[PDB]
Design a protein around this ligand. Structure first.
Ligand SMILES: Nc1ncnc2c1ncn2[C@@H]1O[C@H](COP(=O)(O)OP(=O)(O)O)[C@@H](O)[C@H]1O
Ligand SMILES: Nc1ncnc2c1ncn2[C@@H]1O[C@H](COP(=O)(O)OP(=O)(O)O)[C@@H](O)[C@H]1O
Ligand code: SF4
Ligand code: SF4
Ligand SMILES: [Mg+2]
Ligand SMILES: [Mg+2]
Lengths: 272, 272
């Protein structure tokens, strides 16, 4: 078996930093992991690969002729801890559907046997500002059974969490896609942990971890590394190790209860 | 004539706050303005209407039967300074294309004669995290000739500005859609104005205004108002008046020059 997890959230909230560091901690533990980038930004694997970014399946298919001219070894690349990495890509802005590459990538990986029995986890890093087209496909087509939403006390980040939760509810009658938890990626504000705990309780889930804001993240990423690799003794490395432990141990997977905008606004008003 | 402007930018960057305050300042000046919400969040007009949000064209068409059962007076609502307001709406998460309502709304408004000669400005408030479907339609179909991008020193906000600029370039051979400027919505960081000036110069445009971070915005929005209405003597009200003046006076509309990720990263490294 292998656990299929997807990390969703609004743009810029910390999906790729959180996912790559969580995955590095899992590999440090001895887990075998694959990351599938499902965001057109296409930099979801750079900290595992020590790279600028990664060439995408859409790009490589175009240069090769068809996606069938590609082999799994051409697309999947291994980095820190043996973590295997692939990027979906997507059409240029203004052309097509921004999520179309995700459909191509996930189908290619399934057909080519990337889901080898020895994998312990697959993580999809998915754009979450809209839940449609290829960005909805991991939910609609039962690809990521466990959704973790990165958010913060930002109203827009909590709105995004609610919208993603509505997408999960929409497909609850088929497949097994469930909300596994919220991850608070701190803005360094007071009571923020309590605010995201309260939101998680209202949705029916839990705050799996509170990730502090720590400049060591920037220092690591300037060097194209996770904090886990860059400075294994850092306090922030231990934070990502705690997050990884709690993801591994998590057993709560729910059909969430989306809230009203009145409920969201009351949360922010209350926690001042 | 009437100037057709669209405000794009990543989610949570300040599009709706900036647009509604800019428009309130224009109305205070004596301009006649309409705001067309093109973001599924559908709260782009609440500060003009003193409202929770506004019922959308998609919602009203569904309750009425078809969009043809609606009259312009049912959908357009006037608020502060006589500013006219409409929301597109969009499908629920996980269903359809998130931008499909924008196409329905803009076509309805054109057909129903909302673009009366006495309007001086129309502002579209457009989700900018993806540039596709209905969110691309104002560019692809020549609806908003002047694009202003709200951004900040946040890497993701500058990436979004570059991506929107790529969409403008893609359609430069048809219609008249051009980049009019960047609006920096401050994160209260040092050198931030200089950073966004430098980005604008690299794209071939200008920073039209630097909007400071000011808590008076939150105090006004808790009361469902623009700062212009809530406290006309506030320093921040004068900031929005300066932005509105410069939009009115702006004559630079360009086909932008998108930059590489190396150029973006160098900008952030340089300005520390
Ligand atoms: N816990 C943190 N502390 C400090 N910086 C962070 C933290 N999490 C994310 N960042 C920074 O925030 C920015 C956006 O994070 P990223 O993971 O790229 O967002 P997303 O993938 O959601 O668009 C990056 O510059 C990253 O270094
Ligand atoms: N200049 C500012 N100073 C203080 N708060 C701001 C400013 N601009 C925006 N905000 C706040 O940021 C949040 C997001 O702004 P909004 O305009 O709703 O973003 P978008 O429409 O781009 O998603 C709102 O809570 C708003 O009050
Ligand atoms: S939102 Fe992107 S194509 Fe439908
Ligand atoms: S991205 Fe939304 S439907 Fe294409
Ligand atoms: Mg990312
Ligand atoms: Mg908005």
């Amino acid at each position: 078996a292998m656990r299929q997890c997807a990390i969703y959230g609004k743009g810029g909230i910390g999906k790729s930093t959180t996912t790559q560091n969580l995955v590095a901690a899992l590999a440090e533990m001895g887990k075998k992991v694959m990351i599938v980038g499902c965001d057109p930004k296409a930099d979801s694997t750079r900290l595992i690969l020590h790279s600028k970014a990664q060439n995408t399946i859409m790009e490589m298919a175009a240069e090769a002729g068809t996606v069938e001219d590609l082999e799994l070894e051409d697309v999947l690349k291994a980095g820190y801890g043996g973590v295997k990495c692939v990027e979906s890509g997507g059409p240029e802005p203004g052309v097509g559907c921004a999520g179309r590459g995700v459909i191509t990538a996930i189908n290619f990986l399934e057909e080519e046997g990337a889901y080898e029995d020895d994998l312990d986890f697959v993580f999809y890093d998915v754009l979450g500002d809209v839940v449609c087209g290829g960005f909805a496909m991991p939910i609609r087509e039962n690809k990521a059974q466990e959704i973790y939403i990165v958010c913060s006390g930002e109203m827009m980040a909590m709105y995004a969490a609610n919208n993603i939760s509505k997408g999960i509810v929409k497909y609850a009658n088929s497949g097994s896609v469930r909300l596994g938890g919220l991850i608070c990626n701190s803005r360094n504000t007071d009571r923020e942990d309590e605010l995201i705990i309260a939101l998680a309780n209202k949705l029916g889930t839990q705050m799996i971890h509170f990730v502090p804001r720590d400049n060591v993240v920037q220092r690591a990423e300037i060097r194209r590394m996770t904090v886990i690799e860059y400075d294994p003794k850092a306090k922030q490395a231990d934070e990502y190790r705690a997050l990884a432990r709690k993801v591994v141990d998590n057993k709560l997977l729910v059909i969430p209860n989306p809230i009203t905008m009145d409920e969201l606004e009351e949360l922010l008003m209350e926690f001042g």
